[PDB]
Amino acid sequence: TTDGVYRVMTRLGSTQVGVGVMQEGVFHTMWHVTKGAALRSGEGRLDPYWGDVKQDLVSYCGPWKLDAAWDGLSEVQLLAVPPGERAKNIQTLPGIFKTKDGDIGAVALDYPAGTSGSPILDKSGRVIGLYGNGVVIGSYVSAITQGKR
Amino acid sequence: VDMYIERAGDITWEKDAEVTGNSPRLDVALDESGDFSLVE
């Protein structure tokens, strides 16, 4: 239940399917990572609480808690947790997804699929969204996907 | 198939992070299935 960034694993062997964020007793990840399945955490079980396919987000144990947003000017850090590698910080200036409903920050970083759900951080260390839903331009560009608190 | 979580770190900014990547400005659409696509 401790705050932090976590691998999302599945089982023969184990494989990492994604990443998520524990904050304020709630686990946050991308819908496409778990498809809303229950998660084991040690001997405990985490059940889905809120989810939305269009936003590609899901929270467990309570409502979505992450609410910081990119300021539109500053560099950010992807706290990437790739399969088989220690958590690592990658700093970048986001580009922008321009949509009919407004602009969304986007990071032009291409990490293995099991990194989906990794948090993107502002300079204060607040999570401004999750990595792993995006588009191809052949480089992948991820939206900075944030939910609503 | 059981899915489980393992802690991998604190959520912290790192002063010494590797820096990389571009900042493209892209016109995109978001459909009902959560899929982004390019628009022209």
Numbering used by the authors:
A (entry chain B): 18 to 28, 31 to 156, 159 to 170
B (entry chain A): 49 to 88
Sentences from the paper on this structure:
Here, we present two crystallographic fragment screening campaigns using a 96 fragment sub-selection of the European Fragment Screening Library (EFSL) provided by EU-OPENSCREEN. The performance of this subset was validated in two fragment screening campaigns using the model system endothiapepsin (EP) and the NS2B–NS3 protease complex of the Zika virus. EP is an aspartic protease with the catalytic dyad formed by Asp35 and Asp219 and has served as a model protein for finding inhibitors for other aspartic proteases like β-secretase, a key target for treating Alzheimer's disease. As a second and real-life target, we addressed the NS2B–NS3 Zika protease which is crucial for the viral life cycle of the Zika virus but with its shallow active site challenging to target.
The protein construct contains the soluble part of the membrane bound NS2B co-factor and the protease domain of the NS3 protease/helicase protein of the Zika virus. The NS2B–NS3 Zika protease is a heterodimer, the NS2B co-factor wraps around the NS3 protease domain and forms part of S2 and S3 pocket. For the second fragment screening campaign LigandFit and PanDDA were used to identify binding events. With this campaign 18 fragments were identified as crystallographic binders with a total of 22 binding events. Out of the 22 binding events 10 fragments are binding in the S1 subpocket of the active site close to the catalytic triad forming π–π stacking interaction with Tyr161. Fragments EOS102546, EOS102659, EOS102811, EOS102592, EOS102818 and EOS102869 form π–π stacking interaction with Tyr161. For expansion of the fragment hits seven representative hits close by or at the active site were selected. The binder based on fragment hit EOS102659, EOS41783, is slightly tilted compared to the initial fragment hit with an RMSD of 1 Å between MCS of fragment hit and initial binder. Binder EOS41783 forms a new H-bond with the backbone of Tyr130D and interacts via π–π stacking with Tyr130B. The compounds EOS41783 and EOS90861, as well as the fragments on which they are based, were assessed by TSA, but no temperature shift was observed.
